[PDB]
Amino acid sequence: LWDCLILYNVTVIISKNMLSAGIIWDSVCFFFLLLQRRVFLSHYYLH
Amino acid sequence: FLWMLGQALVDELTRWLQEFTRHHGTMSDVLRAERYLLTQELLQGGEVHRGVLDQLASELLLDRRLRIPELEEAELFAEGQGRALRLLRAVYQCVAAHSELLCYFIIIL
Amino acid sequence: ELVKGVYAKYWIYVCAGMFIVVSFAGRLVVYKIVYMFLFLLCLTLFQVYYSLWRKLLKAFWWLVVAYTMLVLIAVSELFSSILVPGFFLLACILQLHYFHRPFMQLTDMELELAAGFSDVLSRVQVFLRRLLELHVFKLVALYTVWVALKEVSVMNLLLVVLWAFALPYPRFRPMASCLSTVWTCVIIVCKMLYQLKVVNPNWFGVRKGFPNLGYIQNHLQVLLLLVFEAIVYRRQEHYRRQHGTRQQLDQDLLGCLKYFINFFFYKFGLEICFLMAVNVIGQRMNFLVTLHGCWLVAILTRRHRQAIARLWPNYCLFLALFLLYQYLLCLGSTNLISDFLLLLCASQQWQVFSAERTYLDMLKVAVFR
């Protein structure tokens, strides 16, 4: 589910590349999404 | 000094906020003391359930355990910063207890 | 008197300044090379031996003899010539007379609390300077700025054929640097005689060296940067010749800090590259970045880091080739710097992926809940 949200964010940025508003906020989202996807550990998050 | 006065008033505020959250605080001592934790470090958890629910009617006694894995582990840094940090800690406890009232306030605002 | 030995060692940089006044004077071509850039090429000589840093004395010995010969033959104007190069020949002949050793045959490879903190800080920084942090990143940053964003066309040999292949494969990272010194020395030699001699307007994106000062003003900056990096490298190379991984983590805030200062890119690098690709996409929005974005999708649909690791040599290849194409498209820009940043980062992650990998509880509460 987190990976699908990551893909949504990716596609937004990649479709904005093929324009013819900005990716700044979508990149902040990418950072945060990637951060959380990563922190789904089998150790610290398992706690 | 003005600074010193503010310090005392902050502690007065913590007390007042704790009085408001009192019931919920004790309900989170018979439940959340043996629930929420997030302090265990390193790898995984060995005794999974024994390390949480079985650890350490409204006001219960030592029916479960005493304070074997440090009851004051949480109260260490908590009381360590009885100024500043604890004011915000008391604020959170109040709004966790009275979250229904918080919702109402927001909707009329 | 420490300064006695300090000044017996201080002759290379002393000569450099005198060769800077030999530059833009006498012969616009000859003088500059013979004095400044052949001393800069002798610097390269000892660096390219990778064992004789500041030990090469044979060529450095005859550097002086070459300069004496020039002065004996030739160097207002009779007098000018004389005075001016005697001024540098005086210093040069003095090394030949005495104390040639401290800089060339001695530095070899073969107060209170506040001051104490200060010197420690000097050395930690220099440790990072002798680390890849400075050995490479900072150098190539300035290189890209002064090649792609600056004089384009013929400086491709100083970037897209060098660093675009040296970044992914670090085997020839220092060799690339030495060759770079040599080549920009060659570039300044060439632009010395501008281009305005009987212009009859072979084609390599000829921009022509029309200005004097402004035109010679950037290639030398990177030449000096190479030298500076080499200095800090060989300094700690001889300081080492002569003169906590997950454990500090759970200690405290200092422990967390330490761990990550030492091991950021170790783990975060992959997520970094992914976000660096987004940066390129946003600072371009062309059709060229659809390629970057397509590769992003590819390596993001590889999920498990092990599968991304076998797609990594090809990703790094793509990035390198793309930088080269981008130049050949600008010759035969700022976007080039963005693709360089992505290359640099992903190259470092390729050198980690299949290499190096093969009260604070409240903070942990935040990130971990």
Side-chain angles (χ1 to χ4, degrees), chain C residues 19-83 85-87 89-183 185-193 195-281:
Chain C
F19 295 159
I20 264 150
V21 313
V22 118
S23 113
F24 249 17
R27 203 39 235 134
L28 220 78
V29 213
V30 185
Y31 264 37
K32 296 221 201 80
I33 340 154
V34 169
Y35 293 96
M36 196 41 175
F37 315 133
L38 274 201
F39 137 81
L40 247 18
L41 244 14
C42 238
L43 264 254
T44 322
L45 272 181
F46 67 62
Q47 292 153 19
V48 93
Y49 300 148
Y50 306 114
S51 51
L52 258 97
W53 311 70
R54 316 138 328 187
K55 288 160 78 206
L56 166 79
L57 191 248
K58 220 15 288 194
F60 256 109
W61 208 81
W62 245 85
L63 264 203
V64 179
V65 195
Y67 307 165
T68 68
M69 269 26 220
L70 295 108
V71 159
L72 288 163
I73 295 160
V75 271
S76 154
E77 17 80 58
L78 337 137
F79 319 118
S80 259
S81 94
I82 303 160
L83 273 208
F87 294 158
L89 216 254
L90 299 179
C92 249
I93 215 30
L94 274 221
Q95 332 165 359
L96 223 66
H97 292 343
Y98 26 67
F99 333 120
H100 217 315
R101 347 113 22 210
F103 54 100
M104 265 334 126
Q105 331 149 37
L106 258 210
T107 31
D108 314 316
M109 297 313 194
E110 303 110 359
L111 200 66
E112 31 76 66
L113 32 116
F117 308 144
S118 310
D119 57 68
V120 164
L121 288 160
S122 317
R123 62 109 201 147
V124 189
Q125 265 99 88
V126 201
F127 273 140
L128 265 218
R129 294 188 149 264
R130 219 232 351 229
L131 244 251
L132 34 120
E133 298 310 302
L134 263 285
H135 181 213
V136 204
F137 306 161
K138 263 108 238 106
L139 173 69
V140 198
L142 261 335
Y143 251 119
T144 323
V145 171
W146 291 327
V147 162
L149 216 19
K150 242 34 102 246
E151 340 251 38
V152 248
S153 118
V154 286
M155 296 200 82
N156 67 302
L157 287 336
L158 256 192
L159 202 76
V160 304
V161 321
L162 267 201
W163 309 113
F165 301 119
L167 261 21
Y169 311 114
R171 18 222 135 273
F172 24 81
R173 248 171 206 193
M175 171 250 207
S177 112
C178 289
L179 251 71
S180 101
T181 348
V182 176
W183 224 282
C185 259
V186 170
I187 286 252
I188 40 219
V189 178
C190 285
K191 277 317 158 173
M192 270 343 154
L193 24 95
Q195 242 256 196
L196 32 112
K197 2 278 106 170
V198 215
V199 222
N200 5 72
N202 178 65
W203 172 255
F204 24 75
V206 213
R207 335 105 264 110
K208 302 127 145 33
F210 285 134
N212 242 201
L213 191 50
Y215 205 62
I216 72 174
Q217 255 266 272
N218 68 97
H219 333 119
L220 223 227
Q221 299 188 107
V222 248
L223 246 271
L224 288 164
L225 228 244
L226 200 277
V227 165
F228 299 152
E229 196 55 58
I231 293 170
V232 315
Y233 239 91
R234 67 215 198 215
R235 231 197 271 118
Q236 241 143 17
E237 271 173 62
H238 89 273
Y239 285 159
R240 110 227 145 166
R241 239 68 80 95
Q242 315 110 39
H243 319 280
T245 335
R246 273 304 313 247
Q247 34 243 358
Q248 264 263 89
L249 213 256
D250 353 89
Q251 183 240 11
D252 223 49
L253 265 333
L254 213 261
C256 287
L257 266 147
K258 234 30 222 94
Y259 189 28
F260 293 134
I261 280 160
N262 311 322
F263 290 104
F264 224 46
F265 224 86
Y266 182 53
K267 33 200 94 256
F268 298 106
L270 181 70
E271 286 76 57
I272 291 191
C273 146
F274 289 162
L275 274 144
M276 229 61 157
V278 168
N279 171 254
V280 187
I281 278 218

Side-chain angles (χ1 to χ4, degrees), chain B residues 53-104:
Chain B
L53 19 116
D54 271 49
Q55 240 204 355
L56 318 169
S58 28
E59 334 277 290
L60 283 177
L61 17 115
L62 128 18
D63 15 80
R64 286 308 111 232
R65 257 111 252 131
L66 238 92
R67 36 231 41 110
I68 335 271
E70 224 197 326
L71 237 178
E72 42 116 5
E73 199 164 326
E75 291 101 76
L76 260 181
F77 1 90
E79 266 97 287
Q81 336 266 129
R83 262 279 280 121
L85 179 119
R86 229 226 337 195
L87 204 256
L88 329 153
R89 245 80 263 133
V91 166
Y92 177 68
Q93 247 51 61
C94 179
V95 312
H98 318 98
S99 23
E100 179 142 338
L101 276 1
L102 143 100
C103 291
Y104 293 158

Side-chain angles (χ1 to χ4, degrees), chain B residues 4-64:
Chain B
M4 306 300 138
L5 289 157
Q7 300 155 277
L9 290 159
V10 155
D11 305 321
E12 260 105 67
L13 277 154
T14 69
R15 290 165 239 166
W16 300 329
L17 280 147
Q18 272 132 33
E19 272 130 44
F20 260 109
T21 117
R22 222 133 268 197
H23 152 70
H24 148 260
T26 61
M27 261 211 328
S28 295
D29 280 338
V30 296
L31 274 139
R32 253 184 10 140
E34 31 122 317
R35 207 47 258 133
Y36 98 105
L37 244 337
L38 181 69
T39 9
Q40 38 282 14
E41 30 88 74
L42 265 219
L43 358 120
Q44 32 86 243
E47 15 103 72
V48 235
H49 260 195
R50 224 16 227 264
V52 259
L53 19 116
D54 271 49
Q55 240 204 355
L56 318 169
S58 28
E59 334 277 290
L60 283 177
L61 17 115
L62 128 18
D63 15 80
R64 286 308 111 232

Side-chain angles (χ1 to χ4, degrees), chain C residues 290-304:
Chain C
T290 65
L291 277 100
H292 283 298
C294 271
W295 255 102
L296 191 58
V297 177
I299 59 207
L300 260 154
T301 47
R302 243 75 269 155
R303 287 208 58 164
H304 6 86

Side-chain angles (χ1 to χ4, degrees), chain A residues 3-14:
Chain A
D3 267 78
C4 110
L5 236 273
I6 264 130
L7 252 321
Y8 182 58
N9 189 266
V10 173
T11 54
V12 168
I13 305 174
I14 224 221

